[PDB]
Amino acid sequence: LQVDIVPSQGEISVGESKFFLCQVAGDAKDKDISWFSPNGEKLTPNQQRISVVWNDDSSSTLTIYNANIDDAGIYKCVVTGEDGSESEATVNVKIFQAAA
């Protein structure tokens, strides 16, 4: 059971947006896919500055918009199997400010 995030790392300028695509390798027929923020919360699209989309049973896309410095950290994509199998991938999201 394997999950991967594209891109594998990211930097977002303050106020800007970036997406990360989590994909399961293989059949995710009976598998659940969830994104978690650095503070541990399971992420849902109603949240401020956050979008989570489940494209199909094998991939889920996280989008961070209007990026705040408080949004930086290790985000995690977890895939959970019917059989109790489980794996995760992590992406380190850095937030920065620079001359614009």
Side-chain angles (χ1 to χ4, degrees):
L1 181 66
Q2 219 223 135
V3 62
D4 293 281
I5 296 171
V6 172
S8 41
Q9 59 193 53
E11 308 183 345
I12 318 178
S13 174
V14 169
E16 293 299 291
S17 67
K18 188 168 180 62
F19 67 78
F20 307 85
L21 169 59
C22 176
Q23 195 135 25
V24 177
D27 77 282
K29 305 266 159 290
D30 298 285
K31 279 125 182 145
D32 159 285
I33 304 167
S34 295
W35 275 101
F36 294 85
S37 60
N39 67 7
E41 185 182 8
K42 188 190 287 173
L43 290 168
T44 48
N46 62 305
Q47 294 184 237
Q48 295 280 91
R49 296 198 302 288
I50 287 282
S51 158
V52 181
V53 174
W54 288 264
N55 303 306
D56 59 24
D57 55 23
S58 76
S59 95
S60 175
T61 303
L62 162 74
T63 304
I64 300 168
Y65 51 99
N66 188 24
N68 184 284
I69 211 65
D70 283 4
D71 296 328
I74 301 174
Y75 290 71
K76 191 202 315 180
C77 184
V78 178
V79 59
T80 285
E82 179 188 8
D83 56 355
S85 62
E86 162 171 331
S87 198
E88 61 182 55
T90 52
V91 58
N92 178 44
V93 179
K94 300 206 287 182
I95 309 303
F96 71 98
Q97 185 147 255

